[PDB]
Structure formats: structure tokens, C-alpha cells
mmCIF file of C-alpha atoms in Angstrom:
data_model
loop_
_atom_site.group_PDB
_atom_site.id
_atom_site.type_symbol
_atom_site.label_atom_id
_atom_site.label_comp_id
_atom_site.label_asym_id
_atom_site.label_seq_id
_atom_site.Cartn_x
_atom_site.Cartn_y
_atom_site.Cartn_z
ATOM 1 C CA UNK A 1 0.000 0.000 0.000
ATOM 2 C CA UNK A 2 0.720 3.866 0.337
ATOM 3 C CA UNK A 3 -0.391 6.778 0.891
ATOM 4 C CA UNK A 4 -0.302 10.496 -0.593
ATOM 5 C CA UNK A 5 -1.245 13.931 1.423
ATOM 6 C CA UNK A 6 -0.814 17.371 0.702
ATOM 7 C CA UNK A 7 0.579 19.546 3.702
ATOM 8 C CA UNK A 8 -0.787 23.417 4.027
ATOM 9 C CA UNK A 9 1.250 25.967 5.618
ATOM 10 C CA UNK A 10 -0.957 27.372 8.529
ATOM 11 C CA UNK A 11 0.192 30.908 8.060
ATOM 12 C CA UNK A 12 1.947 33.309 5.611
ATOM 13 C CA UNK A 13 5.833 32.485 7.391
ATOM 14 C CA UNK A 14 5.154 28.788 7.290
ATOM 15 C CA UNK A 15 4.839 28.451 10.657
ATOM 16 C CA UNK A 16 3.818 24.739 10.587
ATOM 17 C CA UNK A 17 2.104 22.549 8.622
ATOM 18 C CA UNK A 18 -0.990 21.059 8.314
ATOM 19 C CA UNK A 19 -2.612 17.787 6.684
ATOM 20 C CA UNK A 20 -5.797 16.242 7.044
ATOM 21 C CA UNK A 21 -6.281 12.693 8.901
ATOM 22 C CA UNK A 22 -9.765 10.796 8.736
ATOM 23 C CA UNK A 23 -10.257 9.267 11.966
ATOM 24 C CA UNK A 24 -13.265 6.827 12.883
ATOM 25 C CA UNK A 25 -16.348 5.956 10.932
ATOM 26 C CA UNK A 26 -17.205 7.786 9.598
ATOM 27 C CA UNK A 27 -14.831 10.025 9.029
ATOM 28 C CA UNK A 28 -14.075 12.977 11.234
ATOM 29 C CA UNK A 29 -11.228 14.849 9.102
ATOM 30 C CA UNK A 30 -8.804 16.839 11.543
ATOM 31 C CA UNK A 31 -5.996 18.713 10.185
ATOM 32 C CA UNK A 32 -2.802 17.799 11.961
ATOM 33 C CA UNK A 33 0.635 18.781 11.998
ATOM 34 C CA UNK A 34 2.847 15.835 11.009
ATOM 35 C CA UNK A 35 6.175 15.682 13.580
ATOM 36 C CA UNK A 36 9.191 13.531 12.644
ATOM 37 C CA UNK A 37 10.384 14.953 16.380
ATOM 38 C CA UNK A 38 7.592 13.295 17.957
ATOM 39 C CA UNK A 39 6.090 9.854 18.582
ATOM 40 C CA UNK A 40 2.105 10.667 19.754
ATOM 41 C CA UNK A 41 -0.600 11.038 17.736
ATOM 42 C CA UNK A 42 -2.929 13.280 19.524
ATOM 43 C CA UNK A 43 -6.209 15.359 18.624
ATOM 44 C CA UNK A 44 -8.292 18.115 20.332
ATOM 45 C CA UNK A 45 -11.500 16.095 21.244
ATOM 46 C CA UNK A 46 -14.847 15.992 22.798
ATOM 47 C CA UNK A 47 -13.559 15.558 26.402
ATOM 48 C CA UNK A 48 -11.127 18.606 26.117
ATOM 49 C CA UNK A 49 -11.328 21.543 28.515
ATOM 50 C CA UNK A 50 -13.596 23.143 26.218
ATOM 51 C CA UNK A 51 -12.303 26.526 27.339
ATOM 52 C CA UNK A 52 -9.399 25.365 25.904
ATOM 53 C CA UNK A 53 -10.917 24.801 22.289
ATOM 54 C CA UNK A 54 -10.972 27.786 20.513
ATOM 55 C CA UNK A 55 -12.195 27.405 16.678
ATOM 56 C CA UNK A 56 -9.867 23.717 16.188
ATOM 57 C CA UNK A 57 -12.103 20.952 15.195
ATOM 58 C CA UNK A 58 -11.888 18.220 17.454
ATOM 59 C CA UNK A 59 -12.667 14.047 17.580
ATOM 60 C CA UNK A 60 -15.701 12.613 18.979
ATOM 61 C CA UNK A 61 -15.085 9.359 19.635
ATOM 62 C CA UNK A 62 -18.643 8.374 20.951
ATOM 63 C CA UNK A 63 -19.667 8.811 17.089
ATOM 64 C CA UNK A 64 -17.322 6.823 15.429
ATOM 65 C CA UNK A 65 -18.264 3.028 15.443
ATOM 66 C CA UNK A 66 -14.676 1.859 15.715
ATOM 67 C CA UNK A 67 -13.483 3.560 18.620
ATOM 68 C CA UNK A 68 -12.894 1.960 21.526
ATOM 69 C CA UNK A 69 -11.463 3.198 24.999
ATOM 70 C CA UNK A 70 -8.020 1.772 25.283
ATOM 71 C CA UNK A 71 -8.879 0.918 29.055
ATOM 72 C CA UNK A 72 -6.521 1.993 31.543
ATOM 73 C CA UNK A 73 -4.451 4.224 29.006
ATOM 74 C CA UNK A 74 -3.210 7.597 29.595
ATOM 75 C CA UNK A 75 -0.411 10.019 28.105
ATOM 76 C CA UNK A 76 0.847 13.232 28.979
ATOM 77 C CA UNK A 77 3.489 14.869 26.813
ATOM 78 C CA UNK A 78 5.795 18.367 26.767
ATOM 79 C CA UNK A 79 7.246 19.741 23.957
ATOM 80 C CA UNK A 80 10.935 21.414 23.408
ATOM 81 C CA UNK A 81 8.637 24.821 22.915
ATOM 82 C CA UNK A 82 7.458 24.058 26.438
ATOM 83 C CA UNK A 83 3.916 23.206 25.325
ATOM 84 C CA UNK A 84 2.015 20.115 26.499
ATOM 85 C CA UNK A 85 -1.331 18.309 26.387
ATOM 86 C CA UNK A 86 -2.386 14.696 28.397
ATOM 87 C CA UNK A 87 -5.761 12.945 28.373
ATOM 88 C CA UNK A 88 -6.715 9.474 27.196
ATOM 89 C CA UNK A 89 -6.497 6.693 24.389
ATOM 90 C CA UNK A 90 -8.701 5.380 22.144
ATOM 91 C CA UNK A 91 -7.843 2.654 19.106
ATOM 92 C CA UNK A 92 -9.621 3.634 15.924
ATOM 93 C CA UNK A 93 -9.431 3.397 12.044
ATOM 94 C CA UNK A 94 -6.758 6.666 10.582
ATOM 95 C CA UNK A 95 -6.411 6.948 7.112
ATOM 96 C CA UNK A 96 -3.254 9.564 5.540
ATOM 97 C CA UNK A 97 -4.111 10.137 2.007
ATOM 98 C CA UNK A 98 -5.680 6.984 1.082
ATOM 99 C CA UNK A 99 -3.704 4.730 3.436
ATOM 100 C CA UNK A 100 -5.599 3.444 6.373
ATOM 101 C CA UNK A 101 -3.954 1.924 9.421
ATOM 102 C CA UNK A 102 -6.704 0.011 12.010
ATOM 103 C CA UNK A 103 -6.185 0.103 15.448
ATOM 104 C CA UNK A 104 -4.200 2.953 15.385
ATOM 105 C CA UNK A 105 -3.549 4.618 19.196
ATOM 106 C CA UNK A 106 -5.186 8.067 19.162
ATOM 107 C CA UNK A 107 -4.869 10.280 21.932
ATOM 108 C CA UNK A 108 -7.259 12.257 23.353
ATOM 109 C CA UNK A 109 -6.806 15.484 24.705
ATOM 110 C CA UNK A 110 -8.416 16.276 28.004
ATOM 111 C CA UNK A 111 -5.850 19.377 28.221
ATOM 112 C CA UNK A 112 -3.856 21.598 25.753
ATOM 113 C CA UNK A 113 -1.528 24.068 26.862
ATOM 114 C CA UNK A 114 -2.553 27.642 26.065
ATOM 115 C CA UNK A 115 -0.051 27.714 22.517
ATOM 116 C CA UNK A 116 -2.419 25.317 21.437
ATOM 117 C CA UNK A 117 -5.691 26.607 22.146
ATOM 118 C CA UNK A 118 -4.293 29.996 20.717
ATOM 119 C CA UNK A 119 -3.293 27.941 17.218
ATOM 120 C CA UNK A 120 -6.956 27.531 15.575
ATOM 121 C CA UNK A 121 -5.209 25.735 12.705
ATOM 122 C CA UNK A 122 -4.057 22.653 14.323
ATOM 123 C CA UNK A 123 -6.553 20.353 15.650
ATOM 124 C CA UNK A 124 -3.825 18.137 16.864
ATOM 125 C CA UNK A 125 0.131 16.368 15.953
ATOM 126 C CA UNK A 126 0.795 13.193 14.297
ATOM 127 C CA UNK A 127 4.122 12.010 15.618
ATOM 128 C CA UNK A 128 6.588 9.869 12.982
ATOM 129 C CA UNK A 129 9.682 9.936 15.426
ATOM 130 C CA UNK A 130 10.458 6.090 16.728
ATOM 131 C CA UNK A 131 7.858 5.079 19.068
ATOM 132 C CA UNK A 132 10.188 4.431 21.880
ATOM 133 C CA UNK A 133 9.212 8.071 22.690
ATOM 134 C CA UNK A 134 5.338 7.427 22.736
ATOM 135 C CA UNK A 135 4.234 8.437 26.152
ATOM 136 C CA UNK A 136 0.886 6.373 26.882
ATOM 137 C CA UNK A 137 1.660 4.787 30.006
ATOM 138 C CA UNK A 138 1.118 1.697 30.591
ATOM 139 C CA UNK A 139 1.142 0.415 27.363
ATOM 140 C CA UNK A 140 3.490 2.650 24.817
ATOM 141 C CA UNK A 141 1.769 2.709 21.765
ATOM 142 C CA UNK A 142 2.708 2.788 18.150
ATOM 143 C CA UNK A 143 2.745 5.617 15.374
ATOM 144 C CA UNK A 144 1.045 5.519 12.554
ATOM 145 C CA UNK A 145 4.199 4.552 10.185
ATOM 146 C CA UNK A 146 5.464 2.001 12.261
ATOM 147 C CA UNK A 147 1.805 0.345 12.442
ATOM 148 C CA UNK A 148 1.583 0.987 8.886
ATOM 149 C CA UNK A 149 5.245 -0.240 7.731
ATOM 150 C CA UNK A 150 4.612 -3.693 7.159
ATOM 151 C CA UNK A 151 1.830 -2.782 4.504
ATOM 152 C CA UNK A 152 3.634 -0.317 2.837
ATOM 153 C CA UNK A 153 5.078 -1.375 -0.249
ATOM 154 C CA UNK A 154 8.830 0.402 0.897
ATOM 155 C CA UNK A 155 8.974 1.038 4.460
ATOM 156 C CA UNK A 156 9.918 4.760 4.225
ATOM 157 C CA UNK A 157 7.745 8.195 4.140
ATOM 158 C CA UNK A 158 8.575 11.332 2.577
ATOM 159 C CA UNK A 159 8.536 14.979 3.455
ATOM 160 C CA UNK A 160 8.227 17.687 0.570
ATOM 161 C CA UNK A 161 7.205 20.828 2.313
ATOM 162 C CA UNK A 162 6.249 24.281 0.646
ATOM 163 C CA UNK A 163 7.776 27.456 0.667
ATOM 164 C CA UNK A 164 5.029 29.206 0.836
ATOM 165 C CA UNK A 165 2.979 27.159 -0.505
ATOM 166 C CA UNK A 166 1.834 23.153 -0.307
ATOM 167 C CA UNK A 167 3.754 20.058 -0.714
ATOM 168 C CA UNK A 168 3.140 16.784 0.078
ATOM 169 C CA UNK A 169 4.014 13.524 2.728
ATOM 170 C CA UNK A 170 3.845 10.176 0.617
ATOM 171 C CA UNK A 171 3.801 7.120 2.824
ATOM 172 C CA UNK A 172 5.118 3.678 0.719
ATOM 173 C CA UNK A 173 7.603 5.102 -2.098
ATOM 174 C CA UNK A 174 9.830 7.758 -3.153
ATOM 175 C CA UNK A 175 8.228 10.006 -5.682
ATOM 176 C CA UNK A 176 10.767 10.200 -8.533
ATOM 177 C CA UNK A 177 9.550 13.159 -9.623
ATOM 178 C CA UNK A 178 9.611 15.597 -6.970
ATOM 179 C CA UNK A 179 13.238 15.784 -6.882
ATOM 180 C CA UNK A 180 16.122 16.957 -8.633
ATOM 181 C CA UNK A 181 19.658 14.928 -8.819
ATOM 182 C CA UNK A 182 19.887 12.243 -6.512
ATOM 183 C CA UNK A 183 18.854 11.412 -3.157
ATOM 184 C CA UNK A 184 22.000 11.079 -0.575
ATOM 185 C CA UNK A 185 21.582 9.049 2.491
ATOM 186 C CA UNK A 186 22.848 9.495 5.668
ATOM 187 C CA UNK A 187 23.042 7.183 8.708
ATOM 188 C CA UNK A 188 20.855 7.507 11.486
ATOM 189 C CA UNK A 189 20.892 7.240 15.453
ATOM 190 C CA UNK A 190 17.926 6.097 17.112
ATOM 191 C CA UNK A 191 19.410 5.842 20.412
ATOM 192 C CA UNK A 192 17.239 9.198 21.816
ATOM 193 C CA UNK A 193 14.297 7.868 19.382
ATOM 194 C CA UNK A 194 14.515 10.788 16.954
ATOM 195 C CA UNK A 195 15.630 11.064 13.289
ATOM 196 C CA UNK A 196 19.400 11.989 14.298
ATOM 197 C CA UNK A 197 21.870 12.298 11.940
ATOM 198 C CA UNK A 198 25.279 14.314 11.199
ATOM 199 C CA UNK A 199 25.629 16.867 8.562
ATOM 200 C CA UNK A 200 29.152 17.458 7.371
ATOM 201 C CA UNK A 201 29.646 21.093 7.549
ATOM 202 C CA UNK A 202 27.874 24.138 5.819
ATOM 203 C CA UNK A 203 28.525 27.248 4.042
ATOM 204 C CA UNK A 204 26.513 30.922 4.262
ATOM 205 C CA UNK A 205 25.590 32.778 0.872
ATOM 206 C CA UNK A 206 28.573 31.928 -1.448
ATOM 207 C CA UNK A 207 31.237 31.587 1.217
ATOM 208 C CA UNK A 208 33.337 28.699 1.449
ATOM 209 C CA UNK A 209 32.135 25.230 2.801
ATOM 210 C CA UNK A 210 33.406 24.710 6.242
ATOM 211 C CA UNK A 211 33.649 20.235 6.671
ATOM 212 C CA UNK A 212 32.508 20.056 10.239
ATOM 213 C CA UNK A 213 30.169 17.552 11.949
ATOM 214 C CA UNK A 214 26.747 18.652 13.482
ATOM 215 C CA UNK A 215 25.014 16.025 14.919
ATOM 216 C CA UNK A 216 20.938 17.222 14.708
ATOM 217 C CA UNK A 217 17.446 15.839 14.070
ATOM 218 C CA UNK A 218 15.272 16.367 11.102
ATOM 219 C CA UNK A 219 12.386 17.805 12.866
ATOM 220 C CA UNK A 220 8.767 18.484 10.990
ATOM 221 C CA UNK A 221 7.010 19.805 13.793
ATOM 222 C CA UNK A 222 9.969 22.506 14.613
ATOM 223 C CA UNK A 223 9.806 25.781 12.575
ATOM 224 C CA UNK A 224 13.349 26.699 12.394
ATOM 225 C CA UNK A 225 17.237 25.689 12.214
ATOM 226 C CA UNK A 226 18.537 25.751 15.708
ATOM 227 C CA UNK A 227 22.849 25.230 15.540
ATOM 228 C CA UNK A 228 25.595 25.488 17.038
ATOM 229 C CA UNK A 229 26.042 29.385 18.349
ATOM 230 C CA UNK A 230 29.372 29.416 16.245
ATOM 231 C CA UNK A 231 27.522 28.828 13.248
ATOM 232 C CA UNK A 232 24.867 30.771 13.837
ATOM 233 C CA UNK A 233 27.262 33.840 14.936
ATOM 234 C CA UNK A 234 28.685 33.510 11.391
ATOM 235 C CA UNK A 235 25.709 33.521 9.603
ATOM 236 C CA UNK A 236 24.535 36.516 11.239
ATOM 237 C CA UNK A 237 27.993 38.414 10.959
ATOM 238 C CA UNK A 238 26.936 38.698 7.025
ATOM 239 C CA UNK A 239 23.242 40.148 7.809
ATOM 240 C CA UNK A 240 24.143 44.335 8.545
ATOM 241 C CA UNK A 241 22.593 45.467 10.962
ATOM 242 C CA UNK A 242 21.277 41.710 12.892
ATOM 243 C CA UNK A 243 22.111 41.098 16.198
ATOM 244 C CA UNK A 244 20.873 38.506 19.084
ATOM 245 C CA UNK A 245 18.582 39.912 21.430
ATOM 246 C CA UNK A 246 17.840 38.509 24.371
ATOM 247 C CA UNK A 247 14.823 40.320 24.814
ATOM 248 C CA UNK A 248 13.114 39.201 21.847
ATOM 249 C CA UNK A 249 14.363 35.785 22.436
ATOM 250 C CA UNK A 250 17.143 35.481 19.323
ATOM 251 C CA UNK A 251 18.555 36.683 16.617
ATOM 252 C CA UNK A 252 17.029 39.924 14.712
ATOM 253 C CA UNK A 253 17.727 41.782 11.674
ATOM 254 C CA UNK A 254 16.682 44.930 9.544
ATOM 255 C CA UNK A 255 13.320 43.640 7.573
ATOM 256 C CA UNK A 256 14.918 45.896 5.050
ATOM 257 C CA UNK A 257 18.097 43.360 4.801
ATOM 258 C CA UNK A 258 18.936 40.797 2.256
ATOM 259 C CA UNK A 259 19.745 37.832 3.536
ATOM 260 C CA UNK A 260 21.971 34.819 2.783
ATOM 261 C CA UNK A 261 21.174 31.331 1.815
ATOM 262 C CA UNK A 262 22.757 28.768 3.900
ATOM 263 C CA UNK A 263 24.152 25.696 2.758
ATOM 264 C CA UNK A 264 24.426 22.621 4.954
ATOM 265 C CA UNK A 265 26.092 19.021 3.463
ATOM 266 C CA UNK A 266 24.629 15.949 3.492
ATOM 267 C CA UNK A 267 27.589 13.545 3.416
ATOM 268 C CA UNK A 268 29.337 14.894 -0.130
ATOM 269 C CA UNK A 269 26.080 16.453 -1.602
ATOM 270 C CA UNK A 270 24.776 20.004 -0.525
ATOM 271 C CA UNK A 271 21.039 21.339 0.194
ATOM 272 C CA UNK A 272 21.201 24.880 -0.275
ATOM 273 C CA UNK A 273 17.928 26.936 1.923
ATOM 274 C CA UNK A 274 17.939 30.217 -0.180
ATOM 275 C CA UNK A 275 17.913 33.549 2.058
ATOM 276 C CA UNK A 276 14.450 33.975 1.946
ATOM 277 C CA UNK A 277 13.104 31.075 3.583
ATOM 278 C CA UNK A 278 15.465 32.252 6.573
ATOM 279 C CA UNK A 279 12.836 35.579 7.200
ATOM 280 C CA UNK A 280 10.181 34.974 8.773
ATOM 281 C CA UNK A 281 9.185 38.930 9.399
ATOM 282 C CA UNK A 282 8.618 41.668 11.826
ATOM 283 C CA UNK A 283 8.810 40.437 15.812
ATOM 284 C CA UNK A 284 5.288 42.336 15.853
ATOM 285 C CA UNK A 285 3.134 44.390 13.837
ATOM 286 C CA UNK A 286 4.823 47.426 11.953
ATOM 287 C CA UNK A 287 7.907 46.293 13.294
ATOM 288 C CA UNK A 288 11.429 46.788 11.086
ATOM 289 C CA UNK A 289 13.113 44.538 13.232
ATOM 290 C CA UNK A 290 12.918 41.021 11.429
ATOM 291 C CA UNK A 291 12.897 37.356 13.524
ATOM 292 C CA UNK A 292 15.395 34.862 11.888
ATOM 293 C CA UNK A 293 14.821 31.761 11.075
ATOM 294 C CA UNK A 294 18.512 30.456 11.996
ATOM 295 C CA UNK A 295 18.884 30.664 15.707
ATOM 296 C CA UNK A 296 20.806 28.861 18.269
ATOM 297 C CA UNK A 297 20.505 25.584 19.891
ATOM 298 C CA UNK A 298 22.756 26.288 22.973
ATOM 299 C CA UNK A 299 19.743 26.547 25.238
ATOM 300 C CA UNK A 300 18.127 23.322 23.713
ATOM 301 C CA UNK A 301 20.800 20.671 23.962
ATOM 302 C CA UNK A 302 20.460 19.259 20.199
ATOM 303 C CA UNK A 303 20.765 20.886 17.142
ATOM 304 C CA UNK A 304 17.424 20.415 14.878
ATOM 305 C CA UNK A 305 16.891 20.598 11.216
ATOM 306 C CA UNK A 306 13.223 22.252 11.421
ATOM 307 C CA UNK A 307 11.295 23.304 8.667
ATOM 308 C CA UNK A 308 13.801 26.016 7.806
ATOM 309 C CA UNK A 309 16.005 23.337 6.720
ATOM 310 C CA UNK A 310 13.610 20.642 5.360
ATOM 311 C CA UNK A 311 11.313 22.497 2.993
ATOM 312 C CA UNK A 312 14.751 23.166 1.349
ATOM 313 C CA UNK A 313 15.352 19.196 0.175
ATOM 314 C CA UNK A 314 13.208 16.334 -0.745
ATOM 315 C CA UNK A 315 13.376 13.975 2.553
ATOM 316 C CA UNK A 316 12.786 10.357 2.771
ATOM 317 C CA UNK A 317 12.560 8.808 6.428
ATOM 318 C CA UNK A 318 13.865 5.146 5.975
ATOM 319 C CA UNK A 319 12.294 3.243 8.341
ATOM 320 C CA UNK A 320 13.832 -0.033 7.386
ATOM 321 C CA UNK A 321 15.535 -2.630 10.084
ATOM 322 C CA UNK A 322 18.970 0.047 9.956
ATOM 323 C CA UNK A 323 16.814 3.142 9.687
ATOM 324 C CA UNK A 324 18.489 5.888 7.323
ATOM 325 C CA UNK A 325 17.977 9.596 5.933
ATOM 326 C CA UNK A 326 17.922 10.532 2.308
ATOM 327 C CA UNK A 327 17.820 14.220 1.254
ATOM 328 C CA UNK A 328 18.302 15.652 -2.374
ATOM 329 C CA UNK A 329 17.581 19.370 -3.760
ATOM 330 C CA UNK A 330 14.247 19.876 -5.216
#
């Protein structure tokens, strides 16, 4: 089998992403952001707080006719962002894009944490890390892909997300089309249950490359590029005028600045993110001061390849017995 979805942009800076799940039977479509740095597949519900649903569209399990209460299961989860939810499981029928996994774990929310309330456009995550780091307690469940996997005809997904615009997760096979070149893989470690892998160096605008190892994890459900702050510092140091503040929480620039690409290696091969996918506009309203989208991981103890990075490659997740990563330009 496999499976084909388009994946929205919720906003105008790509904040996240958003594709639509059926879940139940009938279908109840919820539109949820896909996470390769997470392993729960959770949704805004019927039992949540429902001061803390605000315009998301949420799962009623008591309607669908193959949900069942997975007795005795809860899960409670915190994100790197410092968000969180927790309620209760249910098992039910999810289809991505045509392919449908039964018995799938789906968590329902009894609480959100205000960022998600706030976020209208995201009725809940779909997590595609390993499922070591599913957190329903007793039992740890399984993601969708690794339920699916044995069905697929490859076991691998793919990530092809917009600049500005839509793209796509296939589940099954590689799209030959939707790439330019070849694909390079790189080896992964599953040993904190994330996509982690090394890139070999990088390069800003047409500088030279610098071969250097930075150990990160591709990351669907993080915005930006958080590295190293030596890397980051010498990004910035070619952006007049940009500076880290510590008020705002990073690194600014002039909105009336050009900026950069950034080019990071993937073994011998090179994904280049051109400069503007690195704006991602005023810190508020009317604001000239700019927020970039390269910032540093020192405060976050791994370096992660968020959308920044990704929507500048074709990426296949390899979920075979050795998993691997495969990136080309696009």
C-alpha cells in the first residue's frame, strides 16, 4: 500500500504545517501537523477543557463506530517549545491520504496548553519519530508509520514541504519526480528515538564550505534551524545590521536586509535553503526589526533541522531494520 497527502502551511511564514487525517467511521477529518520529532498522535477532542478549544475541530469518539477506549491508558506529553497536552487513548481506524492503518492509538486530549488553544489551525500532531518516545503509560503505543510499515510497499515516508505554498508527505515510495539529482543518504541514530543524523559542515551565501560535523534531528514539527552558536554567529555576521537579542528571544535583523542562503552538506552532496526562507518577518506588527529563522541551539541541547532546513530538500525517512535519511535538492 501507500499513501499520498498534501501539507498546508498554517500561516503566511510557514509556521507549521498542516494535513488532514480521517479518523473513525465515519470520518471525522482533523488537520494535523505531522512531527518527525515526535512519537504521539494526539487530537483536540470531545472531552477537552472546552475553554481550551478555541475554533480547532476536534474528535468525537462516541460517534465513530470503531473507537474503543483503550482501558486503563493515559499520556501526557511536553514539547521542546514548552507546550504540552495529556488525556486518554482510544484505538480507531486513521487513514493519511488513502492509506488506512486500524487500530491505530489516538490520543485524546483532556488538556492543551494555552499555545495550542491559541493555534486555531491545528486540531492536533501526528508524531513519525520512533515510538520508543510514545508516552501512553502503561502500554506505549505505536505511530502511525510504524503500524503501517509492514503494509507499505517500501517502508519509508517522505517529506516535501512548501515554501510558501503546499507540498506533500507520501507514505510507501519515493516520488521520482519531486526531486532533482539524486537522493543522498545518511546514517541515522535512534538511540534518543529521533531522526538523528550528522551533517558534514555548511557554508553561508557563497562563502566557502566549512567540513565540520553537526550532529541534529530532522524535525517536521519545529519551525526553524537551531545550531551550534558558532555557526549561527557567522551567519549573522553577514546580515548588517542583525544582532541577538535577548529580549526578543534570538537573533534579529533589519526587515529591510537581504539575507543569505545557507548551505548545509549531506555527506558529499549540498542542500542549499535560499535567504528567503530564513525571514520569517517583523517580531510584531509594523515592526522593522525582522525574527530569523537560523537561531541557536545552545539553550536546547540538540541541534534540529526544522522546517527552515527541510522544505529546502526532498526527505525520505527510511524506516527499514537500519533506519536511514535521504535528502536531495528539489
Amino acid at each position: 500500500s501507500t499513501g499520498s497527502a498534501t501539507t498546508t502551511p498554517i500561516d503566511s511564514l510557514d509556521d507549521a504545517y498542516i494535513t488532514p487525517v480521517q479518523i473513525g467511521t465515519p470520518a471525522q477529518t482533523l488537520n494535523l501537523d505531522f512531527d518527525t520529532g515526535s512519537s504521539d498522535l494526539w487530537v483536540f477532542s470531545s472531552e477537552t477543557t472546552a475553554s481550551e478549544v478555541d475554533g480547532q475541530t476536534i474528535y468525537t469518539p462516541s460517534k465513530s463506530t470503531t473507537a474503543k477506549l483503550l482501558s486503563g491508558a493515559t499520556w501526557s506529553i511536553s514539547y521542546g517549545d514548552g507546550s504540552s497536552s495529556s488525556g486518554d487513548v482510544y484505538t480507531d481506524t486513521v487513514s493519511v491520504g488513502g492509506l488506512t492503518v486500524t487500530g491505530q492509538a489516538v490520543e485524546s486530549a483532556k488538556k492543551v496548553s494555552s499555545s495550542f488553544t491559541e493555534d486555531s489551525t491545528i486540531d492536533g500532531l501526528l508524531g513519525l519519530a520512533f515510538s520508543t518516545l510514545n508516552t501512553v503509560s502503561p502500554t506505549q503505543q505505536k505511530t502511525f508509520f510504524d503500524n503501517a510499515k509492514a503494509s507499505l510497499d517500501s517502508p519509508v515516508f517522505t517529506a516535501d514541504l512548501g515554501y510558501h505554498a503546499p507540498g506533500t508527505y507520501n507514505f510507501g515510495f519515493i516520488d521520482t519526480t519531486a526531486y532533482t539529482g539524486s537522493i543522498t543518504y545518511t546514517a541515522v541514530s535512534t538511540k534518543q528515538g529521533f531522526w538523528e543524523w550528522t551533517s558534514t559542515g555548511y557554508a553561508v551565501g557563497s562563502g566557502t564550505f566549512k567540513s565540520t560535523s553537526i550532529d541534529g534531528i530532522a524535525d517536521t514539527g519545529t519551525t526553524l534551524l537551531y545550531l551550534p552558536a558558532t555557526v549561527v554567529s557567522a551567519y549573522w555576521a553577514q546580515v548588517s545590521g542583525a544582532k541577538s537579542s535577548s529580549s526578543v528571544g534570538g537573533y534579529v535583523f533589519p526587515c529591510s536586509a537581504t539575507l543569505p542562503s545557507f548551505t548545509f552538506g549531506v555527506g558529499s552532496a549540498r542542500i542549499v535553503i535560499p535567504g528567503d526562507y530564513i525571514d520569517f518577518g517583523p517580531i510584531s506588527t509594523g515592526s522593522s526589526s525582522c525574527f530569523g529563522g537560523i537561531q541557536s541551539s545552545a539553550g536546547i541541547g540538540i541541534n534540529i533541522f526544522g522546517d527552515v532546513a527541510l522544505k529546502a530538500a526532498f526527505v525520505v525517512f527510511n524506516g527499514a531494520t537500519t533506519p536511514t535519511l535521504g535528502f536531495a535538492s528539489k
